[PDB]
Amino acid sequence: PVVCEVVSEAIVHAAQKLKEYLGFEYPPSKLCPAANTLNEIFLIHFITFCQEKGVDEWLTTTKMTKHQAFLFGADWIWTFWGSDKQIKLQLAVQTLQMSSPSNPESRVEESWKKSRFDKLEEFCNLIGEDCLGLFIIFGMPGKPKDIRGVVLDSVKSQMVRSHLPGGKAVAQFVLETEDCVFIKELLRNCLSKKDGLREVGKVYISIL
Amino acid sequence: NFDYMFKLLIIGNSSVGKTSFLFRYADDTFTPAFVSTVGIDFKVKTVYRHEKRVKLQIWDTAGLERYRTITTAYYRGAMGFILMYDITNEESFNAVQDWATQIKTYSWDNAQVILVGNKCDMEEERVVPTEKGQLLAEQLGFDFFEASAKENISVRQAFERLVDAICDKM
Ligand SMILES: Nc1nc2c(ncn2[C@@H]2O[C@H](COP(=O)(O)OP(=O)(O)OP(=O)(O)O)[C@@H](O)[C@H]2O)c(=O)[nH]1
Ligand SMILES: [Mg+2]
């Protein structure tokens, strides 16, 4: 399954390119780059890596619009197509900045007061079994240039012990956890045996 | 602000022209590239009907069965539906009855429905005659339009008819 190895290399490449911009603050201000800017930089490097390797035929990167990002609790979606022309996997990726601590609402006027965590969980429930939520943390408290990953199911499992809200649960999970699984070790279950993911256990996903 | 707000949804098989329909109505533009909708999206358009300001929250649903669950959750609170088939594609017209019962199952909030056969600029590739669409719409109790998002035919008329139907039921 070539797509797994090439996409893992793409993820590590994009994160390493993004590390340059992490830990930057404007000269007088405490302001960092916008979350959308970081997400777009990461996505552009990732997609340019998937091109020149010829794997875009089996992988589609869809950046959520502002409306889609607000509704789905996802910042983009990776759809993995199989040997046939059928969808085999979907990763709903939400990014976080934990170097500094709110979701801005759209012009909806009909209701929607949930967290990004609950929205992502509901999105992945609605899509189906082969859709998994994935948090990517750009920078942690200390080590502002550290990029990590956490599967949503791991946080959900930790929530049966912590009994605290999902965002604080992801925050507690990115700390408190030293065991790591490499990104290529993950995603080896791309087009088969979706039980390997969602059963990754108490572990974070390391990029570099 | 505004005087009314109506939730409209656009449903139908994939590659039928739901996004193209929405983009033509909202931005008066068209692009031939096929970017399939992931789950759902929406756009807001303000119109003036019956000397009243009506805002339209128009949701573009995905046509693939894979999203049929998530899309259905957003039928909640919908007041109007654009059920679209493609006159080029017979499978899309055969799927209409299933879409209509899906409307009935998941909203049925006295939601008005409009049946639309898109791509009517593609007369050389038509496989569903106009009479078939008229008959099915008359049976189901829907108003009917053949339209083209490419050439901007009967797009505004379809949306305005939906808005008129919603306004009258009050
Ligand atoms: N000739 C012609 N082509 C059209 C028309 N409307 C859409 N198309 C083309 O048909 C294809 C379907 O476009 P979409 O609007 O994205 O189809 P869709 O209903 O949104 O499909 P999903 O997003 O998967 O649900 C695109 O390649 C368009 O360029 C039309 O009125 N006439
Ligand atoms: Mg679409």
Residue numbers in the entry:
A (entry chain A): 18 to 118, 129 to 137, 139 to 236
B (entry chain B): 18 to 187
From the study:
One such Rab15 effector is Rep15, which is known to have a role in receptor recycling from the endocytic recycling compartment but otherwise remains poorly characterized. Biochemical validation of the interactions is presented and crystal structures of the Rep15:Rab3B and Rep15:Rab3C complexes provide additional mechanistic insight. We find that Rep15 adopts a globular structure that is distinct from other reported Rab15, Rab3 and Rab34 effectors. Detailed biochemical studies reveal that Rep15 is selective for Rab15, Rab3 paralogs and Rab34 and does not bind to other evolutionarily similar Rab GTPases.
To do this, we either mixed purified Rep15 and Rabs at 1:1 ratio or co-expressed and purified Rep15 ΔN1:Rab3AQ81L_19-217, Rep15 ΔN1:Rab3BQ81L_18-190 and Rep15 ΔN1:Rab34Q111L_1-237 complexes. All obtained complexes were used to perform the crystallization screen and finally, we obtained crystals for Rep15:Rab3CGppNHp_Q222H_10-227 (bovine), Rep15:Rab3BGppNHp and Rep15_ΔN1:Rab3BQ81L_18-190 complexes. Subsequently, we also obtained Rep15:Rab3BGppNHp and Rep15 ΔN1:Rab3BQ81L_18-190 complex crystals, which diffracted to a resolution 2.75 Å and 2.8 Å, respectively and crystallized in space group C2 and P21 respectively. We solved the Rep15:Rab3B complex structure using Rep15:Rab3C (bovine) as a MR model and Rep15 ΔN1:Rab3BQ81L_18-190 complex structure using Rep15:Rab3BGppNHp complex structure as a MR model. The asymmetric unit contained two copies of the complex. Both copies share nearly the same overall architecture, as indicated by an RMSD of 0.124 Å for Rep15:Rab3BGppNHp complex and and an RMSD of 0.109 Å for the both copies of Rep15 ΔN1:Rab3BQ81L_18-190 complex. Structurally-based sequence alignment of Rab3A and Rab3C shows that apart from the switch I, interswitch and switch II residues, three RabCDRs of Rab3A are involved in making contacts with the Rabphilin-3A, whereas in the case of the Rep15:Rab3 complex structures, RabCDRs are not part of the binding interface.
